[PDB]
Symmetry: D2
Subunit: 493 residues, 4 copies
């Protein structure tokens, strides 16, 4: 932290906020202030957007060869790997998740940049067989333009990489703003990108409250695409604001992801994966398997096994090797999780285990919340329908394959889910009917740069990762040339 | 005139496999803009009718009867629609001309295009179910399956009713979606007729639905209902924005096409007479009521005076009249409200200091007195700061601005909130290509105007829209990607203590 | 009655013409060995004239520069004619080739779908725009029709195989010269009549009738040919490829196979028996996709052999026009003799002819080219009867112990066209499918193929593909057009 | 020279550097002075067979063929980085072995780095397609797998460049390969094998055979365990290879040179056209598959063009590829120079004019090398052997044409179809012409431009298939349709 920048990065320069305001960043493990950064203004955000537009129109990045753009994106990928240790530590300090989880993030981030580096020069568009004689028809794919990018606090650098990599690869200019409470890795990646070298204005980092600078990032006339990952309420607000300029939006908003366990699942595998689904990063994951659906014939056996394991989950400091689950991100977020416990009980569900702050001494100063299992609930309940985004799972039974599908689809969301069954034919039937962007068969949480990620229904609009993710950052232009032009002579001479 | 067509035309909405009146029995009189006479009367539906249609589309979608039909068979049905369009080409063209005022010849060209749109998408239906991914994780299979997006609402404008409908209906049916369509309340005739033809082909109950009525009565239901997966709208910018904001309530995908301020760039080395011809075509086809209209002429200074004179002299000869008469070159505008809007723009142009060089009023001639006619108009001595240059008038009106250099042409052409289409005229093809590469437009024509077709995507940069219609990209609006990842050798992670 | 109005001539450069030497050939019905029709037997000069006419038409641009959309519409019109004449075409095919009328109806439905598929694909490409690594350049790849193509088909599924070649050729804008098997030209003549009704520029389509040994070499070895597409046997295929090499001409070959039908002990047993029968005996095993090599898990091998043999004895032989017929005759005297000589080979190597292996004695079968459905047991991979394509109503049965051994045995042939895996354990069937060196692998099915997916062989089963986008791509050629938009002198060489 | 002290002299088979089975060797020559510079193993047909069988064994093991596509990409990228790291030494080796200028060799090495990088990036970007099946209750997918065992044979003009075009996609897709460079120019290929060994590939995945095409070539093209033969060279050897591959119905990818037209209209930028006619004709002494050996010039400017070209041809600086002022080095071998010389006799006997050059240069410092003067042949026509046949030397012919139509007819009037250019300031016209030339690559107002992002290959007798681009990678893939019936039912056709 001694050498980490504390400033925004606008138009090739590290700069303070226009009003000199600052914000203290906290470690959720002990609620101690660990760093202080600039808290930018809406005029700073506007200046970044105007700089991105100017850089885009200069052509220095947008007209660079795709091959060269790919080489630069690859150079970022290499810096991530080179600084893997320090990045992982920063991420754990800022977000609370285990160091091992943070190492896995850094390995993935390297692969994300590498994937897009390699995709950069592989399209360009299509030649069309024109239906009009004596014409040439082609579709050229250009960078979409100036893009704003807003990320959440759970996986700051990972989510940032999903946006930055395709934007740079395609030739866009970008303005990024990480969550105000978790900016450290994002500042660091900007330092690394500056070392690679990009024309002035091509990349910009704004630091600040979503409520202060967010609307300018979603509502400015010079933006061609707003790409946001976070919660549903902010997402909807952002889309409404983007509508003022008919601006493209790419949204990923979390989910109510079903984890469907059939009676012919590998039982110990399913228990393992129900734990993974529920409690990695204290359930603060877009992909969290918060809604367990278990076949009735094994429901009691399953609940007992799960509960017994949940009691053994090891809570602690993300830097300690024995820690299995760290704290949740903030006081506000822990309070929200606590109020959901009251909701669940008032609706008549059972808090089978957990449901409170742990009492242990070394956990007292941190934002800890016990891994929790909620039983005796049904699809009509708020605790089942709503994304708690904490270390909490619900358990519902189902009788038949048809019922599992109906229940799993009975939410406003559609991001991801899993089916556990040794009968692969059955798992595939079920997968084909789930209205989800990603379905895992005998697995959980698996995602990678090669394949698109995103939501049906209220889980989002568009995709990130894969060729489809890159396509958000492109725009099609049909250039039609009449090679033997003739007068139409419709209007009198 | 047009008579016999209407004798057997349905007057009702089509919901869940039945032709039905409005829930409140309300009706609306449809007008011919040539003479402002009532030509037909149709049901004016309610918001509950729209909701019932949406719920019927959802039920049909979940039944799987269309959404799980083979893509090959779906293509065959979309092809059968295409064949019915061609079979009824004459009656459809006549209806369209009766309802919208444009010339019969223009309507025939629409019907040919509509046939080709359905045929294109019929052929595309079974050509792409997704991808196999080379997974980075050993012992996994990764595949991307493309499914129909789901239930789609489709809202069309009054200028090219059936054409715009076909751009939405064809890919929706080809992919296996269920749909609810609502044409403009003032021009529903061809859309009713195409629903009759689709019914003849045969689609499961609830797969297709037609709502008739005011956007202000049923529009919000169509854009804001939780059971909709995609709202596809073609029309004006204000309504588009409102629709997008409403769709946000359910994070619903939107596909918008909203018109433009399309530049027609004429260099001093253009084929002069060609450029004059195409400036006229750009400006005045369908009385300029076209998303692709070339309303903003940018002409190189060295030939600007010559160009203005030639264009003005031609504009005075444009033949106004009944769309059914063979000599007619330009029909009336669509409604009293729209003519009034065009008129108020003339006042704006003069107040900001532009010159109405020719036209700018209603014609006096006797056979035109009863119709919604407005003279083809040329506005000169204007600049990019003016409202008359920046805003879409959507009437038989063009502005003319000069430019000195290639760079200036590009800067001016890009200086608008829009980005739908434009043209470059020059015999120096290398130059036209440079310019085309720099225009922020979804479509650029080199030595042509108004050319569009099913094979290529159409849509706007900036405020001209979101997404694309036509082409493979158009079909993709009606698809959704699902990543199915199978772990073929699953192992416990053993992260959490046992 | 069909035959009363059917043309007897070749179709060259827009005209129905006799052979240059007036020679003819009698066409036979294999059910009764009776002459049913007589057609021209063309010369090598006729073939050359067709090729030169195809070249001329191609260079005129009338088809090759027609819009892709309009080409598609014409291919679609052919598809509709096939359906319209479905009954007569099916009857002709059954008369000429001997297979059951029901099989022929299924062919005609498929043929309609092939033409329709390619009609729909015609205008869906054109090529790519490339993001060039050189500043101030535009790089595009335009896909053009390959050019003049020669097309040679076999006698088992004449029209079906013809459609696989004609449809993409016309869709892409090529000119073509087609020659069906000399012994089965009826439906191919008919389809040329139908194409003439649709209307194509003169020289775009040509039909040569005659012996492969008389006109074949011209079709494969002429300098004006850009692609030779052949479906048939391995020996002719190799000969063709060697001849095509004289002009470095592209080749697309599909040469049959030794297709494994792998049955695990956890297969749905009755399904596997049913499909082993389908695999072995449809069209008297005269199918590129025939499942002639059964590999059955040792644990169920005796059970399987007994059940298969008992069913094989009930197979109903007869006239393809009779509804109760399950298997018709084989195609010719020469082919039946070849099948017979294989029986001698199998016995000399020590295999057992468990059932069949001879001509049936029954009276109504005496005059036709019948051969009994046959099962050969007690054999192994070293045997000629196992390694070689018999292309008759004959299957061999070998046992395997493990999954690994099934794969090893199945892949132990020179061929690589198609095969199946039968197992209720889908995971296992998929593992096996990934390791088989075959262009098509069926999991719990057999003989399934369709226009939407490419068909072709690894190893000695062929080169290239037919059907699907890949099938169309055989009839395209890529051209990279690179424009320097700001050309500068290099000034390497002294001024 | 110091380069050579540590360079391997052996073949690389099944993970080991090995000598020829019979200890035979071959002396490698520098064409600048005809001196022996190195001695390598001259392998036997049994060595080639052993390599092929090792490639097959490796392929079946799955260690490379089932490695993740992402990881295969990373390895191909590591090869790319080694090429750039060793750019200087590789360029010098290439110049020493082939005679071309050091500057040309540097450009090759830059291009080779980009080829490996391109294919590294493409490795994990496909996998196949999901098909919407026309049969209910079925799942249809096309999986793209490595084609299998591939044999790769390269020529002497751009040894490492041509090698990279084959190696990169083969490794990216998961194939096993056996490569054999031209017997007279093996140095950079040996070196690249050393570099690949440093990256690390499973045993048998890569193999290098060294030797005479006439001794080991037939095994490489005719062995039953080969799935693809990829050959770049001359037409006669290509045809022989294709005939041999036919014995096992083996896929072939051939690129065989051309008779590439350089079409110059009277509205071309004249000085640009002269510059590019020189580049087209004389880079690497015309020993280029892309050489613009057939100039077609509009009649109206033909005399002006000839005079301007001839005057420049006289100024071309011949010399040692290592000297900075050298513009054109020697041709590759005695046999090749003799072939070029016999073509001069042919041209004269047919009545063409040798307008300039047409002989060995007399100058002292050129006396010991395999030099041949840059040559312009005029007063010829399309019926002549000198016009129809690929000389592959520093020689161009010049023919006139009257109209656009005639330019096209003449340019297409050859057995070949690899590449060509159109020079005209009228871009509309250049595009019309380009659309009608039967060529795999057409340059508008440029020459010799090719790159990994776009496919390269020939119409007609210039080849079969493509190298470079996605289409190049596709030569190293094979499609398998896996069709699963998810609700199987008995057909019940045959009696029970
Ligand atoms: N892109 C085009 O082709 C196009 C078409 C028509 C109009 N325009 C432009 O838009 C301007 C306004 O045209 P307009 O107002 O006559 O048409 P509009 O933009 O309102 O679009 C008409 C369609 O939208 C429906 N609609 C109206 N309110 C709605 C709501 N709240 N929710 C859902 N649907 C609703 C209408 O009933 C009709 O079907 C014109 O002056 C012109 O500049 C462009
Ligand atoms: Na959504
Ligand atoms: Na937009
Ligand atoms: Na083969
Ligand atoms: Na060829």
């Amino acid at each position: 932290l001694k050498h980490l920048s504390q400033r925004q990065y606008i138009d090739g320069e590290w700069v303070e906020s226009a009003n000199k305001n600052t914000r203290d960043i906290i470690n959720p493990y002990n609620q101690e202030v660990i760093f202080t950064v600039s808290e930018g203004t809406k005029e700073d955000a506007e200046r970044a957007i105007l700089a991105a537009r100017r850089a885009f129109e200069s052509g220095e990045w947008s007209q660079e060869t795709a091959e060269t753009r790919g080489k630069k994106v690859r150079a970022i990928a290499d810096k991530i790997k080179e600084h893997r240790e320090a990045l992982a530590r920063l991420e754990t300090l800022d977000t609370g998740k285990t160091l091992e989880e943070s190492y896995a993030d850094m390995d993935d981030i390297h692969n994300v940049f590498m994937y897009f580096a390699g995709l950069a020069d592989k399209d360009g568009g299509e030649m069309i067989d024109s239906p009009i004689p004596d014409t040439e028809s082609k579709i050229v794919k250009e960078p979409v333009g100036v893009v704003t990018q807003i990320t959440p606090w759970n996986y700051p650098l990972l989510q940032a990489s999903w946006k930055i990599a395709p934007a740079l690869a395609t030739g866009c200019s970008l303005v990024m703003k990480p969550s105000e409470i978790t900016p450290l890795t994002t500042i660091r990646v900007f330092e690394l990108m500056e070392e690679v070298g990009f024309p002035k204005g091509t990349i910009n980092l704004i630091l600040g409250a979503g409520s202060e600078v967010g609307d300018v990032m979603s509502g400015h006339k010079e933006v061609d695409l707003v790409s946001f990952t976070g919660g549903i309420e902010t997402g909807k607000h952002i889309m409404k604001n983007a509508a003022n300029n008919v601006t493209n939006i790419a949204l990923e908003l979390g989910g109510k992801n079903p984890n469907i366990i059939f009676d012919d699942a590998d039982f110990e595998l399913a228990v393992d994966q129900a734990l993974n689904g529920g409690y990695f990063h204290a359930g603060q994951v877009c992909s969290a398997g918060s809604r367990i659906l278990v076949q009735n014939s094994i429901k009691d056996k399953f609940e007992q096994a799960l509960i017994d394991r949940v009691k053994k989950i090891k809570l602690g400091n993300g830097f300690d090797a024995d820690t299995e689950m760290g704290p949740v991100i903030s006081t506000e977020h822990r309070n929200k999780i606590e109020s959901y416990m009251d909701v669940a009980k008032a609706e008549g569900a059972t808090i089978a285990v957990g449901g409170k702050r742990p009492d242990r001494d070394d956990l007292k100063d941190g934002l800890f919340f016990e891994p929790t299992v909620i039983t005796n609930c049904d699809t009509s309940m708020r605790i089942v329908q709503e994304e708690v985004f904490g270390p909490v799972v619900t358990v519902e039974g189902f009788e038949t394959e048809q019922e599992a599908i109906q229940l799993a689809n009975d939410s406003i969301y559609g991001l991801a889910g899993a089916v556990f069954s040794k009968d692969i034919g059955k798992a595939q039937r079920v997968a084909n009917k789930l209205k989800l962007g990603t379905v895992w068969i005998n697995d959980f949480h698996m995602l990678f740069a090669q394949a698109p990620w995103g939501g049906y229904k209220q889980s989002g609009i568009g995709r990130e990762l894969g060729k489809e993710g890159l396509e958000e950052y492109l725009v099609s232009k049909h250039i039609l040339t009449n090679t033997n032009p003739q007068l139409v002579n419709w209007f009198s001479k």
